[PDB]
Design a protein around this ligand. Structure first.
Ligand SMILES: *C(=O)c1ccc(-c2ccc(-c3ccc(C(*)=O)cc3)s2)cc1
Ligand SMILES: *C(=O)c1ccc(-c2ccc(-c3ccc(C(*)=O)cc3)s2)cc1
Ligand SMILES: *C(=O)c1ccc(-c2ccc(-c3ccc(C(*)=O)cc3)s2)cc1
Ligand SMILES: *C(=O)c1ccc(-c2ccc(-c3ccc(C(*)=O)cc3)s2)cc1
Ligand SMILES: *C(=O)c1ccc(-c2ccc(-c3ccc(C(*)=O)cc3)s2)cc1
Ligand SMILES: *C(=O)c1ccc(-c2ccc(-c3ccc(C(*)=O)cc3)s2)cc1
Ligand SMILES: *C(=O)c1ccc(-c2ccc(-c3ccc(C(*)=O)cc3)s2)cc1
Ligand SMILES: *C(=O)c1ccc(-c2ccc(-c3ccc(C(*)=O)cc3)s2)cc1
Ligand SMILES: *C(=O)c1ccc(-c2ccc(-c3ccc(C(*)=O)cc3)s2)cc1
Ligand SMILES: *C(=O)c1ccc(-c2ccc(-c3ccc(C(*)=O)cc3)s2)cc1
Ligand SMILES: *C(=O)c1ccc(-c2ccc(-c3ccc(C(*)=O)cc3)s2)cc1
Ligand SMILES: *C(=O)c1ccc(-c2ccc(-c3ccc(C(*)=O)cc3)s2)cc1
Ligand SMILES: *C(=O)c1ccc(-c2ccc(-c3ccc(C(*)=O)cc3)s2)cc1
Ligand SMILES: *C(=O)c1ccc(-c2ccc(-c3ccc(C(*)=O)cc3)s2)cc1
Ligand SMILES: *C(=O)c1ccc(-c2ccc(-c3ccc(C(*)=O)cc3)s2)cc1
Ligand SMILES: *C(=O)c1ccc(-c2ccc(-c3ccc(C(*)=O)cc3)s2)cc1
Ligand SMILES: *C(=O)c1ccc(-c2ccc(-c3ccc(C(*)=O)cc3)s2)cc1
Ligand SMILES: *C(=O)c1ccc(-c2ccc(-c3ccc(C(*)=O)cc3)s2)cc1
Ligand SMILES: *C(=O)c1ccc(-c2ccc(-c3ccc(C(*)=O)cc3)s2)cc1
Ligand SMILES: *C(=O)c1ccc(-c2ccc(-c3ccc(C(*)=O)cc3)s2)cc1
Ligand SMILES: *C(=O)c1ccc(-c2ccc(-c3ccc(C(*)=O)cc3)s2)cc1
Ligand SMILES: *C(=O)c1ccc(-c2ccc(-c3ccc(C(*)=O)cc3)s2)cc1
Ligand SMILES: *C(=O)c1ccc(-c2ccc(-c3ccc(C(*)=O)cc3)s2)cc1
Ligand SMILES: *C(=O)c1ccc(-c2ccc(-c3ccc(C(*)=O)cc3)s2)cc1
Ligand SMILES: *C(=O)c1ccc(-c2ccc(-c3ccc(C(*)=O)cc3)s2)cc1
Ligand SMILES: *C(=O)c1ccc(-c2ccc(-c3ccc(C(*)=O)cc3)s2)cc1
Ligand SMILES: *C(=O)c1ccc(-c2ccc(-c3ccc(C(*)=O)cc3)s2)cc1
Ligand SMILES: *C(=O)c1ccc(-c2ccc(-c3ccc(C(*)=O)cc3)s2)cc1
Ligand SMILES: *C(=O)c1ccc(-c2ccc(-c3ccc(C(*)=O)cc3)s2)cc1
Ligand SMILES: *C(=O)c1ccc(-c2ccc(-c3ccc(C(*)=O)cc3)s2)cc1
Lengths: 5, 5, 5, 5, 5, 5, 5, 5, 5, 5, 5, 5, 5, 5, 5, 5, 5, 5, 5, 5, 5, 5, 5, 5, 5, 5, 5, 5, 5, 5, 5, 5, 5, 5, 5, 5, 5, 5, 5, 5, 5, 5, 5, 5, 5
């Protein structure tokens, strides 16, 4: 996945 | 998935 | 999926 | 799906 | 689906 | 689908 | 899917 | 999927 | 998937 | 996957 | 995977 | 979805 | 959906 | 839907 | 989804 | 258990 | 269990 | 357990 | 497991 | 496990 | 394990 | 345990 | 383990 | 997803 | 344990 | 282990 | 995902 | 233990 | 081990 | 993922 | 232990 | 071991 | 991942 | 121990 | 995965 | 070992 | 994998 | 990963 | 011990 | 994975 | 061993 | 793997 | 993996 | 692997 | 792995 912050 | 914050 | 916040 | 908040 | 809040 | 609470 | 809480 | 809380 | 909190 | 907190 | 905090 | 056993 | 066993 | 066993 | 055993 | 929604 | 909605 | 939503 | 007051 | 007041 | 006030 | 959401 | 006030 | 045992 | 979200 | 105020 | 035992 | 998110 | 105020 | 025992 | 996120 | 204020 | 025993 | 993130 | 910050 | 203010 | 904090 | 015993 | 991240 | 900061 | 202010 | 902090 | 900073 | 701090 | 700074 890809967590973006 | 992709969590966006 | 995609959770948006 | 897509949860929006 | 799509939950909106 | 869609479900709240 | 989509689920809140 | 998508799940919040 | 995607999950917050 | 993707998970925050 | 991906995990924050 | 939302399972509460 | 929403299962409450 | 909403199952309450 | 969201399992609360 | 004892589920109170 | 004992489900109170 | 004892789930209070 | 069972609910009370 | 069971819920109280 | 069980919930109280 | 004792889950309070 | 169980939750209190 | 989000398991709360 | 005693999970408070 | 159990949560308090 | 997010397991809270 | 005693998890407070 | 258990959480306090 | 994110295990909180 | 006593995990406060 | 346990957390305080 | 991220284990917090 | 006593983990505060 | 890929965490971005 | 336990955390304080 | 990928994990922050 | 990141173990915090 | 007493881990503060 | 790949953590970016 | 335990952490203080 | 990959881990920061 | 590869941590970049 | 890869770990910073 | 490879940490880059
Ligand atoms: C060999 O067995 C093998 C198996 C899996 C892989 C993967 C490379 C990237 C993967 C991945 C990317 C992004 C996400 C989230 O969006 C999840 C997994 S798996 C390589 C070699
Ligand atoms: C080899 O067996 C293999 C299997 C799976 C993969 C994946 C690469 C990216 C994946 C992914 C991306 C994004 C999301 C969320 O949106 C979930 C999974 S799986 C690579 C190699
Ligand atoms: C190889 O076996 C394989 C299987 C699945 C995948 C996926 C790439 C992205 C996926 C995904 C994206 C977004 C969402 C939510 O909207 C859910 C799943 S699965 C790659 C390779
Ligand atoms: C390979 O087997 C495979 C299977 C499924 C997928 C998916 C990519 C995105 C998906 C998805 C997106 C959005 C939602 C909610 O709206 C649910 C699922 S599944 C990729 C590869
Ligand atoms: C491959 O097998 C595969 C199967 C399903 C999918 C999906 C992509 C998005 C989906 C979806 C979107 C929105 C909702 C709610 O409105 C429910 C499902 S399923 C991709 C690939
Ligand atoms: C060994 O042969 C083998 C079997 C399974 C896998 C996986 C590839 C991608 C995986 C994955 C990544 C991210 C997520 C996020 O939820 C879920 C699954 S497992 C590799 C090698
Ligand atoms: C094996 O290949 C396999 C079997 C099942 C799955 C699932 C991914 C998400 C699932 C799910 C989503 C939502 C709910 C109600 O929340 C229940 C199950 S099953 C992946 C791979
Ligand atoms: C195997 O390939 C497989 C079997 C089932 C699934 C499911 C994903 C989500 C499911 C679901 C959603 C919502 C509800 C009522 O909430 C019940 C089940 S089943 C994925 C893959
Ligand atoms: C296998 O491919 C498979 C079988 C069933 C499913 C389901 C996804 C959501 C389902 C569902 C939604 C809502 C309700 C009443 O809430 C009951 C079931 S079944 C996915 C994949
Ligand atoms: C084996 O190859 C295999 C079997 C299952 C899986 C799953 C990845 C995510 C799953 C899932 C997502 C969401 C929910 C309700 O949250 C339940 C299960 S199962 C990967 C690989
Ligand atoms: C069909 O196999 C089937 C479905 C459910 C069950 C259950 C065994 C124990 C259950 C339960 C225990 C405790 C509580 C809360 O106090 C709620 C449900 S359901 C057996 C067989
Ligand atoms: C058809 O197989 C079938 C469907 C449900 C069941 C159940 C076994 C135990 C159940 C249950 C236990 C405890 C509580 C709450 O106190 C609620 C349901 S249902 C068996 C067979
Ligand atoms: C079908 O095999 C089946 C499904 C569930 C169960 C359960 C065994 C113990 C359960 C339970 C224990 C404690 C609490 C909270 O106090 C809630 C559920 S469910 C057995 C068999
Ligand atoms: C089906 O095998 C099955 C599913 C769950 C269980 C459980 C054993 C202990 C459980 C439990 C203990 C404590 C708490 C919180 O106080 C919640 C659940 S569930 C047995 C068999
Ligand atoms: C073996 O090859 C194998 C089996 C399972 C897996 C999984 C990677 C991520 C999984 C998962 C993601 C999300 C959720 C609900 O959060 C549950 C499970 S299973 C990888 C490799
Ligand atoms: C099915 O084997 C199964 C699933 C869970 C369990 C559990 C044993 C102890 C559990 C537990 C202990 C303490 C707390 C918090 O106070 C929460 C859960 S679950 C046994 C068997
Ligand atoms: C053996 O080859 C094997 C078995 C499982 C795995 C997994 C890598 C990541 C997994 C996972 C990701 C996310 C979640 C919910 O967060 C649960 C499990 S399993 C790798 C290699
Ligand atoms: C199934 O084997 C199974 C799953 C979990 C367990 C547990 C034993 C002790 C547990 C626990 C102790 C303390 C705390 C926090 O106070 C939380 C969980 S879970 C046994 C068997
Ligand atoms: C043996 O060859 C083997 C077995 C498992 C593994 C894993 C590497 C990362 C794993 C994992 C990642 C993320 C999560 C949820 O965070 C859980 C497990 S398992 C490598 C080699
Ligand atoms: C299944 O074997 C299983 C899983 C976990 C355990 C645990 C033994 C002690 C645990 C624990 C001690 C202290 C704290 C924080 O105060 C948290 C967890 S879990 C036994 C058996
Ligand atoms: C033996 O050959 C062997 C077994 C396991 C491993 C692992 C390397 C990294 C692992 C891992 C990464 C991430 C997480 C969740 O962070 C859990 C485990 S296992 C190497 C060699
Ligand atoms: C399954 O064998 C298992 C897993 C964990 C344990 C633990 C023994 C002591 C633990 C612990 C002590 C102190 C603190 C912080 O105060 C946190 C965890 S876990 C036993 C058995
Ligand atoms: C040989 O067995 C083997 C197995 C897996 C790999 C991987 C190279 C990159 C991987 C990966 C990239 C990105 C992500 C997240 O997006 C997850 C896994 S696995 C090499 C050699
Ligand atoms: C024996 O040949 C052997 C067994 C395990 C290993 C490992 C090298 C790195 C490992 C690891 C990396 C990351 C994490 C979560 O950070 C956990 C374990 S195990 C080498 C040689
Ligand atoms: C399973 O054998 C197992 C895992 C961990 C332990 C522990 C013994 C002492 C522990 C501990 C002491 C002090 C502190 C910080 O104050 C944190 C952890 S863990 C026993 C058995
Ligand atoms: C020989 O057994 C072997 C097995 C694995 C590898 C890998 C080289 C790079 C890997 C990797 C790259 C990036 C990521 C994250 O995105 C995860 C794993 S595994 C070499 C030789
Ligand atoms: C000895 O024969 C043996 C068995 C396993 C391995 C591994 C190669 C790459 C590994 C690894 C690197 C980085 C990460 C990050 O999470 C996880 C696993 S273990 C070498 C030699
Ligand atoms: C011989 O047994 C052996 C096993 C593993 C290796 C590896 C060379 C590079 C590796 C690696 C690169 C990058 C990453 C992160 O992205 C993780 C592992 S493993 C050499 C020889
Ligand atoms: C002896 O025969 C033996 C068994 C395992 C290994 C390993 C080769 C590469 C390893 C490794 C490097 C870096 C990382 C980062 O997380 C994980 C595993 S262990 C050598 C010799
Ligand atoms: C003989 O047993 C043996 C085993 C492992 C190796 C390795 C050479 C380079 C390795 C490595 C490179 C880079 C990374 C991170 O990206 C991790 C491991 S292992 C040589 C000889």
């Amino acid at each position: 996945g890809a967590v973006e912050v």
